[PDB]
Design a protein around this ligand. Structure first.
Ligand SMILES: CCCCCCCCCCCCCCCCCC(=O)OC[C@H](COP(=O)([O-])OCC(O)COP(=O)([O-])OC[C@@H](COC(=O)CCCCCCCCCCCCCCCCC)OC(=O)CCCCCCCCCCCCCCCCC)OC(=O)CCCCCCCCCCCCCCCCC
Ligand SMILES: CCCCCCCCCCCCCCCCCC(=O)OC[C@H](COP(=O)([O-])OCC(O)COP(=O)([O-])OC[C@@H](COC(=O)CCCCCCCCCCCCCCCCC)OC(=O)CCCCCCCCCCCCCCCCC)OC(=O)CCCCCCCCCCCCCCCCC
Ligand SMILES: CCCCCCCCCCCCCCCCCC(=O)OC[C@H](COP(=O)([O-])OCC(O)COP(=O)([O-])OC[C@@H](COC(=O)CCCCCCCCCCCCCCCCC)OC(=O)CCCCCCCCCCCCCCCCC)OC(=O)CCCCCCCCCCCCCCCCC
Ligand SMILES: CCCCCCCCCCCCCCCCCC(=O)OC[C@H](COP(=O)([O-])OCC(O)COP(=O)([O-])OC[C@@H](COC(=O)CCCCCCCCCCCCCCCCC)OC(=O)CCCCCCCCCCCCCCCCC)OC(=O)CCCCCCCCCCCCCCCCC
Ligand SMILES: CCCCCCCCCCCCCCCCCC(=O)OC[C@H](COP(=O)([O-])OCC[N+](C)(C)C)OC(=O)CCCCCCCCCCCCCCCCC
Ligand SMILES: CCCCCCCCCCCCCCCCCC(=O)OC[C@H](COP(=O)([O-])OCC[N+](C)(C)C)OC(=O)CCCCCCCCCCCCCCCCC
Ligand SMILES: COC1=C(OC)C(=O)C(C/C=C(\C)CC/C=C(\C)CC/C=C(\C)CC/C=C(\C)CC/C=C(\C)CC/C=C(\C)CC/C=C(\C)CCC=C(C)C)=C(C)C1=O
Lengths: 164, 496, 454, 55, 176, 79, 54
């Protein structure tokens, strides 16, 4: 990164830890939270990586960096899958028509079960890929599947744990 | 096996006529110009190296390497081994070294090396060397006493290009007058390189003295005086027509698929005629012994070598004499070797540990097709020369008997050296090419290990006795003002 | 610009490196190869950096005396046993890493593990051996007995890292060498040679399970761990000059110029490897197939033309990485009167990375970087060094395929971004030996890191 | 050499020499340069007395 | 960034014309309009203007060469780089006579004399330099392509050379 | 990953004249070997600076001659 | 059927000379053809007077 600022390791540790908890504590389910904050996270994350570069082997800063990077990886992955689910739900809503009356109802999704099969497969991949972020995955993608399950009857492993 | 050549069976590769359009599809893809491009940010710019980034790697396919032998219809033999490494080592060996020169042809073998990778029928000098450079390949040519080698080291995906460039040196080189005249510079550089390596320079003095003015005594390097008269494209072409032929050439490839290597080599000779094979005068070396005292005013140290003739690589004494070299071993003060690095060889125990004035003592052993040299090389300060020779002579008189422990240690160290030297690919390439040129056969490292285990003390005594009956060759280099005379050495060894 | 992927099917056809952590914390890494010879050793995280100022030089002393007898064996018995196996015990000690390995035949793999374990765990640091080695080390310590490349390598660290232990030399100061005793070495063994810092690397016709079983048996009594290393700030790079002006050592002058580099695990490390390859190396006495006047390397080509004679008798780039810092620069050996042209040309070349680097030069450099790296992995000892050094540096071994994948992403634009951020208008350190009237002040050379043009 | 330039380009209107030689394209080829005739020892054309009789 | 878009356009275009046959190597038939022009203008123009003018100039040139006793290829100036590179490689026997002819010509021209008519019966348009001019052009084209395909950056006004490309020291006014 | 070889490849034959893989000793530590591991008298690391070309440096030897001068002739102002 | 090395050797540029080179190219023996004035005609008689004073 192009910068002339200098930070001590104590300052670098504080910045990295603050960003790590800011991302993990944020509610990823609300789309607007990621839209508004991600631009701020990226700017900070660029600074944190630059100042923490000499401490990637440090016994304290090192683990924080690995968790921070892993959390950002999971945030983008969960957002992408849940973003697709939102599109499917929005398509279903518009197919209802005006006032849910069908007055100007649009064309329905003809391959809804296929989409449900595709989304659930992606959901399983997240769980295997990010074993330490299940609470966040269930918050965004797991809850999204439950909403879809109301529209269409499909089977996924955790369906019974969502009262289905 | 479809053809047996000089004791080895090869698979015959048939020439095939292929349209140039079809082959062009198979040439490796590369560019010299990058006129524009599609911009793409480094996706791993924020990923530390400790985090793996590659996923879904195909499972590896491991095969035990095996040496395979093939031959073209023009008579060029192809030997390759695929160790599944990522860098190839292509080598072209031609049975035309300095030993085949007549006195009027002095230095022509070295001249051929100097004009290597110059203009060919289908490529310019500049285009050849820029292609080698852009593709990240290294290599060169080296002319020896019995063979001349062209070698390239490259990423294996570019093998089709490299094989073509090497072959062009012997298929259709344009020995243009002005290009050849630009190679006169290399003669002075070659002398400087040789004289810098004191061990090699003394080795050349040995061979010139050991074989007086005949095959193995011909100077390796051309002189820069009267030899330049025939340093001409026409003279070089006449020399190549005498000796360079597909029947005397072997192509060696390490870490290359054999079928691909054979296919591309076949396509290179498909529509062209190689130099025809003609009989040549092949005379056995004449060993005379003798001595030479070469002063080097700058050096204060004295390098002494005493050598004896050996029957050579094709004899049954190859392994016993090699075991004798490891038993005596040697070493030097310069280095401080740890365990297993010759600290208990006979020369190290009997010379270096007991004579603080000895700077270094070693046993050398050069092997060629039908002759070789074995002896001791000892160095020290100039004024010490009379004592250095006495030490060397005393060791030569102790080769009458060997203890069982020494024989076993020598055999085990030799086997370790064989296996450890083999794992180097450039070494394996040069070993295979030299063996086929010398003998027409390849003895694998494991087969040499079996021979080493069969060497007994009786064999060592017999081989040593034969060596000591030859007229010694006595070379002194550096500060020679105190060395003993040749007759002193001969009388000392006359008793044996 | 992106020109495609250079990964091939052959890159995937390599035996996997299996790494397991023993209960004590020692990592055991092995790769099978179809060879009749093997290399087994212990790559330990230790070195001069982790020594204190008073004890500097103990690690080097220990390395030299470790193989000179053990409690169970003797120097003659140990040397005899290794020779009977047809093997050779080797070792080295650096600022941050140390290794004790044996090149052996197939039958000697397990016997060599025993010998190496005995030397590391039960060293018999006899006083007589120590005193003889003190004489040898003292002679080695003399500058007259060191090469000029070795001197400059140490002086680059002394000048660049004045505030931290990386500035210490491995051999140590003569005052410490004079005073080191068995107790110093015994303490260093206890504190630094612990299981958590050791990796047992076996390359050859080896089975991972068998090596692991032998390792657990022979290294059972090793100290499991030592206290965590002190937490320290980023090593401060001091822009300084340390020049030994000697007009009584002949015509050649030796100069080394350094920039602050990057640590091993930096995302930019591979970019710095490529920049090191672009700088390349040249020798007037080994020009290669392409002459300097027609070289693709821009630094080499412009240099060869200077004054119709050439201003570089020898030069090489260097890229040195440590856990939290690195050094990037070039080393020159050139005629006295040529030094101003030589340093000016090699600095103009590094500054060009920030402004005008062609795709052609990058792509050539990628191929010659890959050739150097892959050819180094040809023999077992080359593989073993790679496994051990990488696991210590990264905690894992990067595959050839992964290295190529990451290198594919790096292009002229990426080199330009990294150079603009880190090397453009950057601070430099200059070090030298020999006749250096032509060498200018540090500030004058530090102004060549940026251009008025563009 | 001093700053210098050659017109080594790909014209849009003029063909290269390989395509259309501008010289009289009849040469004699030998195997070695020594096989060429020697002009000094070679008889030239018979001298003329009138400028209108020149070849 | 617009430069990135421009770079992609250049790359795609050039990739789409690789291996194109040069205009001169195409078998081209004249259009029905150029054929008419060649049928009418060209014959009359050759008969009345081009033919006579160019014969008049050519015959004068042959006479000038014969008066100096030189060949046409002698007249080439070695300030042209192709000529200089060709002259490096010409064989000695050709070189000796070329020098002698050129020296005689300058003496004749300087003293305002002409070669005796006894020595003028030769064809001055024999192309003896052609093999070497073609070799020199090949050598120069290889160097142009493999070594001069980009405007290179070098340190300026150092070692007697401007750094803008020339290779001889003190060969410009600003390098005195 | 670490680089274990100099940036300038040797390009020469590893084996010396007349010496084979069998009779060359151990190329890992033999004095005459061209690929022997250097001894770390002062420690590991300096091989990154080291010049592996065995020929000693000849200061000021010309490599920038394009054929414009004969050996021993001193150019004057480049001409 | 010629060895490629021999075939490419013939096409050396030194092996091509224009038809009629030996019968046309002038071979001057002097830069002063017969009939032209030179020092042998302008030398003054040996009995001449000193020309330095004038
Ligand atoms: C309301 C009004 C508004 C007006 C707005 C006007 C805006 C104008 C914007 C202009 C912007 C600037 C342009 C500058 C370009 C610079 C290019 C350059 O330097 O390139 C060097 C570059 C160097 O290349 P190189 O590789 O180093 O060398 C190439 C080799 O030499 C060999 O290359 P090769 O073998 O591949 O050949 C390529 C070929 C390619 O050639 C072409 O394609 C060019 C063709 C040009 C044809 C022009 C014909 C004009 C005819 C007008 C007819 C009017 C009819 C009216 C009818 C009325 C009916 C009622 O070239 C040739 O054959 C030779 C070219 C010779 C060029 C000579 C240059 C002279 C310039 C000055 C001339 C005028 C001054 C005297 C008169 C002034 C007073 C009147 O040259 C080239 O590549 C060739 C380019 C040649 C360009 C010439 C253009 C001339 C245009 C004249 C316009 C006249 C207008 C008249 C109007 C009349 C109306 C009634
Ligand atoms: C025929 C087929 C069809 C044809 C279709 C043609 C298609 C093209 C036309 C359409 C073009 C659309 C352009 C879209 C632009 C997008 C804009 C945008 O979103 O921004 C992203 C865009 C790119 O962002 P990025 O992705 O980060 O890339 C950065 C690079 O700039 C990226 O650039 P680069 O790296 O690629 O480098 C090239 C760079 C730079 O390229 C150049 O500058 C080309 C230079 C070539 C040499 C020119 C020599 C001079 C020639 C003069 C000729 C005069 C002839 C007159 C003839 C008269 C008689 C007829 O180009 C640009 O910066 C793009 C320019 C975009 C348009 C805005 C500027 C246009 C010129 C306006 C001039 C107005 C003059 C008024 C005069 C009034 C007189 C009274 O932002 C910019 O950089 C654009 C602005 C550039 C600076 C313009 C000047 C700004 C002035 C601000 C004044 C502030 C005053 C404050 C006062 C405060 C007092 C308290
Ligand atoms: C209605 C309103 C309208 C408004 C419109 C507004 C329009 C605004 C227009 C703005 C100006 C546009 C000018 C465009 C020109 C394009 C020419 C072209 O096609 O060039 C291709 C051409 C390439 O030709 P080539 O045949 O392919 O290869 C060339 C070589 O043979 C072999 O090439 P090579 O690549 O193999 O050789 C390597 C070497 C080749 O190097 C060269 O070619 C350099 C040649 C020597 C340059 C130095 C000459 C000596 C000094 C002359 C000045 C003396 C007095 C100065 C002080 C006076 C104080 C009272 O290349 C390099 O070194 C690459 C990097 C070069 C840049 C280095 C930067 C540091 C030095 C700074 C000076 C150079 C800056 C770039 C050029 C600027 C052009 C204007 O390149 C050049 O022309 C090179 C530049 C030479 C001209 C420099 C002129 C400087 C300004 C003088 C005052 C002018 C006043 C007159 C009016 C000005 C306005 C028009
Ligand atoms: C429709 C409207 C049209 C309008 C038309 C007008 C258009 C406007 C533009 C006109 C001007 C164009 C300028 C072109 C610049 C070219 C730059 C360049 O490439 O230079 C290198 C280039 C050499 O090429 P190269 O060899 O390839 O370069 C490689 C080497 O590195 C090169 O290096 P090199 O060393 O070999 O060559 C360098 C060369 C470059 O120089 C030149 O060749 C001359 C260039 C500049 C020309 C003069 C410009 C004058 C205009 C500005 C002044 C206007 C004042 C107005 C005031 C009004 C007030 C009311 O020589 C020098 O540098 C000599 C420097 C000598 C300085 C001596 C100073 C005195 C001693 C020191 C100080 C005093 C002592 C200390 C005292 C202390 C007291 C205590 O130069 C040339 O070859 C060209 C020279 C110029 C030829 C004529 C150009 C004609 C332009 C066409 C239009 C003409 C229209 C008709 C005009 C009629 C007027 C009455
Ligand atoms: C309406 C029509 C408008 C037409 C506009 C036309 C404008 C034409 C303007 C021409 C200006 C030319 C400037 C060239 C500068 C020198 C060449 C150069 O860049 O050299 C690179 C070279 C090469 O640099 P380098 O990049 O190799 O640097 C290597 C390392 N260092 C930086 C340490 C040298 O620079 C030099 O070596 C020269 C010294 C620096 C010169 C800096 C600029 C001088 C500015 C003068 C001050 C007074 C200005 C007053 C103006 C007032 C406003 C009117
Ligand atoms: C109803 C009647 C309709 C008539 C239509 C008009 C027809 C006229 C066509 C001829 C003139 C225009 C094309 C000239 C081509 C040669 C120039 C060229 O290629 O340059 C070489 C070089 C390009 O070289 P290069 O780098 O491509 O290399 C090619 C090199 N050779 C030729 C050797 C193969 O040009 C340049 O360097 C840049 C030129 C920039 C653009 C210049 C201006 C172009 C014209 C703009 C319009 C102005 C006139 C009209 C305005 C209104 C008038 C009232
Ligand atoms: C789609 O379902 C819905 C949601 O999702 C469930 C919502 O969340 C929400 C909550 C959202 C909000 C509060 C956001 C703000 C919403 C607003 C402002 C309302 C948006 C909805 C609308 C404006 C309704 C869309 C427009 C219409 C239905 C048109 C209304 C006019 C109508 C029906 C008149 C047309 C009548 C005809 C064409 C008949 C013509 C008669 C003849 C020709 C007879 C002629 C006779 C003779 C004699 C000649 C709503 C309101 C919703 O409807």
């Amino acid at each position: 990164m192009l910068t002339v600022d200098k930070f001590t390791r104590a300052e670098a540790l504080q910045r990295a830890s603050n960003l790590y908890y800011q991302v993990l504590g944020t509610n990823w389910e609300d789309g607007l939270n990621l839209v508004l904050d991600v631009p701020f996270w990226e700017s900070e994350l660029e600074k944190v990586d630059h100042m923490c570069e000499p401490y990637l082997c440090d016994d304290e800063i090192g683990p924080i960096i690995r968790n921070l990077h892993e959390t950002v990886n999971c945030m983008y992955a969960c957002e992408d899958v849940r973003d697709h689910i939102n599109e499917l739900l929005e398509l279903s809503s518009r197919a209802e028509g005006v006032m849910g009356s069908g007055a100007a109802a649009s064309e329905e999704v003809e391959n809804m079960p296929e989409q449900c099969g595709m989304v659930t497969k992606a959901y399983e991949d997240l769980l295997a890929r990010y074993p330490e972020h299940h609470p966040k995955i269930e918050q965004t993608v797991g809850h999204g599947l439950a909403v879809l399950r109301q529209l269409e009857k499909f089977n996924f492993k955790s369906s019974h744990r969502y009262f289905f | 096996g479809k053809s047996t050549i000089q004791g080895t069976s090869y698979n015959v590769v048939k020439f095939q006529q292929e349209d140039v359009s079809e082959v062009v599809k198979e040439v490796p893809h590369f560019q010299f110009y990058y006129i524009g491009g599609e911009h793409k940010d480094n996706k791993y710019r924020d990923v530390p190296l400790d985090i793996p980034v590659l996923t879904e790697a195909p499972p590896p396919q491991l095969k035990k390497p095996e040496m395979k032998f093939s031959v073209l219809e023009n008579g060029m033999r192809i030997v390759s081994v695929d160790k599944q490494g990522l860098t190839s080592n292509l080598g072209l060996f031609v049975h035309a070294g300095s030993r085949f020169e007549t006195p009027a042809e002095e230095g022509l073998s070295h001249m051929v090396e100097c004009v290597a990778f110059r203009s060919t029928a289908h490529l310019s000098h500049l285009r050849t060397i820029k292609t080698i450079e852009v593709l990240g390949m290294n290599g060169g040519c080296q002319a020896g006493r019995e063979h001349i080698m062209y070698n390239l080291e490259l990423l294996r995906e570019y093998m089709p290009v490299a094989s073509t460039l090497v072959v062009g040196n012997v298929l259709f080189p344009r020995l243009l007058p002005w290009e050849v005249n630009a190679c006169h510079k290399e003669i002075k550089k070659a002398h400087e390189r040789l004289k810098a390596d004191t061990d090699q320079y003394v080795s050349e003095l040995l061979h010139q003295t050991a074989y007086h003015n005949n095959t193995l005594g011909n100077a390796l390097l051309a002189n820069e005086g009267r030899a330049l008269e025939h340093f001409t494209g026409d003279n070089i072409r006449e020399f190549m027509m005498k000796h360079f032929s597909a029947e005397r050439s072997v192509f060696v490839g390490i870490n290359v698929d054999h079928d691909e290597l054979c296919k591309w080599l076949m396509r290179s000779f498909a529509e062209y005629v190689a130099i025809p094979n003609l009989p040549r005068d092949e005379a056995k070396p004449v060993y005379t012994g003798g001595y030479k005292l070469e002063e080097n005013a700058d050096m204060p140290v004295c390098n002494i070598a005493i050598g004896f003739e050996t029957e050579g690589w094709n004899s049954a004494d190859l392994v016993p004499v090699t075991v004798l070299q490891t038993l005596l071993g040697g070493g030097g003060s310069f280095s401080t070797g740890g365990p297993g690095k010759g600290m208990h060889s006979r020369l190290y125990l009997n010379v270096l540990n007991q004579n603080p004035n000895v700077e270094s003592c070693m046993a050398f052993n050069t092997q060629y097709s039908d002759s070789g040299l074995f002896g001791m090389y000892i160095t020290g300060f100039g004024q010490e020369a009379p004592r250095l020779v006495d030490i060397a002579l005393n060791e030569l008189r102790k080769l009458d008997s060997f203890t069982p422990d020494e024989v076993s240690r020598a055999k085990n160290t030799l086997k370790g050296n064989i296996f450890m030297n083999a794992e180097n690919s450039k070494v394996l390439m040069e070993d295979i090419g030299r063996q086929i040129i010398m003998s027409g056969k390849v003895v694998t490292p494991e087969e040499f290990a079996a021979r080493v285990d069969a060497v007994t003390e009786a064999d060592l005594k017999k081989v040593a006795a034969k060596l000591l009956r030859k007229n010694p060759t006595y070379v002194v280099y550096g500060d020679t003002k105190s060395a003993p005379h040749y007759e002193y050495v001969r009388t000392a060894l006359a008793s044996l | 610009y992106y020109w495609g992927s250079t990964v091939t099917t052959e890159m995937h056809n390599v035996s996997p490196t299996q790494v397991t952590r023993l209960p004590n914390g020692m990592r055991v890494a092995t790769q099978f190869s179809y060879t009749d010879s093997a290399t087994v050793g212990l790559w330990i995280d230790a070195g001069a950096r982790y020594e204190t100022k008073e004890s500097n030089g103990t690690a080097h002393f220990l390395e030299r005396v470790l193989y000179l007898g053990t409690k169970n064996r003797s120097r003659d018995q140990l040397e005899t046993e290794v020779e009977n196996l047809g093997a050779n015990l080797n070792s080295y000690t650096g600022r941050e890493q140390t290794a004790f390995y044996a090149k052996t035949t197939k039958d000697g793999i397990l016997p060599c593990i025993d010998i190496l374990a005995d030397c590391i765990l039960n060293p018999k640091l006899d006083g007589d051996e120590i005193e003889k080695e003190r004489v040898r080390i003292t002679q080695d310590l003399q500058a007259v007995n060191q090469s000029y490349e070795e001197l400059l390598y140490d002086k680059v660290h002394t000048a660049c890292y004045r505030d931290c232990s990386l500035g210490q030399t491995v051999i140590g100061p003569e005052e410490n060498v004079a005073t080191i005793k068995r107790d110093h070495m015994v303490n260093y063994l206890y504190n630094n040679f612990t299981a958590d810092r050791m990796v047992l690397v076996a390359v050859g016709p080896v089975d991972h399970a068998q090596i692991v079983k032998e390792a657990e048996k022979k290294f059972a009594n090793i100290r499991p761990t030592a206290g965590p290393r002190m937490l320290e700030e980023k090593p401060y790079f001091c822009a300084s000059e340390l020049v030994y002006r000697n007009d009584d050592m002949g015509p050649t002058a030796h100069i080394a110029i350094a920039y602050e580099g990057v640590p091993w695990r930096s995302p930019d490390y591979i970019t710095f490897m490529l920049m090191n390859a672009i700088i390349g190396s040249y020798d007037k006495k080994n020009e290669g197939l392409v002459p300097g006047l027609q070289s693709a390397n821009r630094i080499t080509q412009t240099g060869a033309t200077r004054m119709d004679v050439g201003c570089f008798d020898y030069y090489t780039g260097f890229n040195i990485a440590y856990k939290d810092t690195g050094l990037f620069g070039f080393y020159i050996a050139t005629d006295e009167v040529a030094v101003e042209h030589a340093v000016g040309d090699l600095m103009f070349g590094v500054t060009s990375f920030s402004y005008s680097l062609t795709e052609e030069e990058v792509m050539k450099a990628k191929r010659e970087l890959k050739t150097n790296f892959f050819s180094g992995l040809d023999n077992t000892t080359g593989v073993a060094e790679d496994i051990g050094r990488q696991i210590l540096a990264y905690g894992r071994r990067l595959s050839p395929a992964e290295f190529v994948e990451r290198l594919d992403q790096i292009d002229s634009q990426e080199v330009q971004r990294v150079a603009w951020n880190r090397l453009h208008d950057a601070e430099i350190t200059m070090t030298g030996v020999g006749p250096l009237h032509g060498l200018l002040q540090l500030w004058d050379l530090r102004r060549q890191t940026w251009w008025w043009r563009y | 050499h001093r700053p210098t330039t050659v017109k080594m380009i790909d014209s849009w209107r003029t063909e290269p020499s390989s395509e259309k030689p501008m010289w009289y394209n009849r040469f004699d080829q030998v195997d070695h340069i020594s096989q060429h005739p020697d002009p000094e020892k070679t008889e030239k054309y018979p001298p003329v007395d009138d400028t209108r009789k020149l070849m | 960034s617009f430069h990135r878009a421009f770079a992609r356009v250049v790359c795609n275009y050039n990739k789409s014309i690789e291996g194109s046959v040069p205009w001169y190597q195409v078998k081209r038939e004249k259009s029905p309009f150029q054929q008419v022009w060649d049928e009418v203008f060209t014959p009359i123009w050759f008969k009345l203007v081009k033919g006579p003018y160019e014969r008049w100039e050519y015959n004068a040139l042959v006479a000038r060469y014969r008066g100096m006793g030189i060949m046409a290829d002698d007249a080439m100036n070695d300030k042209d780089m192709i000529v200089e590179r060709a002259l490096d490689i010409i064989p000695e026997d050709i070189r000796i006579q070329r020098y002698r002819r050129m020296m005689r010509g300058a003496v004749l021209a300087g003293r305002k004399l002409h070669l005796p008519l006894e020595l003028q019966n030769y064809d001055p348009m024999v192309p003896y330099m052609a093999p070497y001019i073609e070799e020199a052009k090949f050598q120069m084209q290889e160097e142009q392509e493999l070594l001069a395909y980009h405007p290179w950056d070098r340190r300026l006004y150092t070692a007697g050379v401007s750094g803008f490309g020339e290779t001889s020291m003190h060969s410009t006014f600003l390098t005195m | 990953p670490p680089i274990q070889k100099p940036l300038l490849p040797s390009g020469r034959a590893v084996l010396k004249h007349g010496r084979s893989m069998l009779c060359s000793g151990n190329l890992s530590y033999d004095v005459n070997s061209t690929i022997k591991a250097p001894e770390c008298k002062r420690g590991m690391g300096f091989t990154q600076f080291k010049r592996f070309t065995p020929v000693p440096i000849e200061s000021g030897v010309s490599v920038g001659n394009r054929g414009w001068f004969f050996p021993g002739v001193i150019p004057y102002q480049g001409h | 059927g010629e060895p490629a090395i021999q075939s490419i050797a013939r096409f050396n540029p030194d092996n091509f000379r224009p038809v009629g080179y030996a019968e046309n190219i002038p071979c001057p023996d002097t830069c002063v053809p017969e009939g032209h004035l030179d020092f042998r005609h302008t030398r003054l008689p040996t009995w001449h007077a000193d020309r330095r004073p004038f």
